[PDB]
């Protein structure tokens, strides 16, 4: 019994927690993609291009 699968038996400990984050999501074609234009969060009021 050797199935090609993720398997990963035992593998104790972890952290399965999800948090709610405000971000805008759009539908293109069939896929659901993130639409991020991060210019205010990062690269704002700093001397990097």
């Amino acid at each position: 019994s050797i199935p090609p699968q993720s398997n990963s038996d035992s593998t104790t400990a972890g952290l399965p927690v999800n948090a709610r984050v405000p971000a805008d999501l759009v539908i293109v074609g069939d896929k659901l993609v993130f639409l991020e234009a991060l210019e205010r969060r990062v690269y704002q009021a700093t001397r990097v291009a």
């Binding site: 990062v42 690269y43 704002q44 009021a45 700093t46 001397r47 990097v48």
Partner: protein
Amino acid sequence: QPMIARDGPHPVDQPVHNYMVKRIHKRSLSAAFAIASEALSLLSNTYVD
């Protein structure tokens, strides 16, 4: 101001603090109001009329 870390042939940046001082500017407001001399003579009877 915030900071961003990057590698390669870029100098390492350190955060910059700014200090600014503004000052006040004094203006005014004026309005005129006239009393006729006959009205002043009427209002300065001093228990005669």
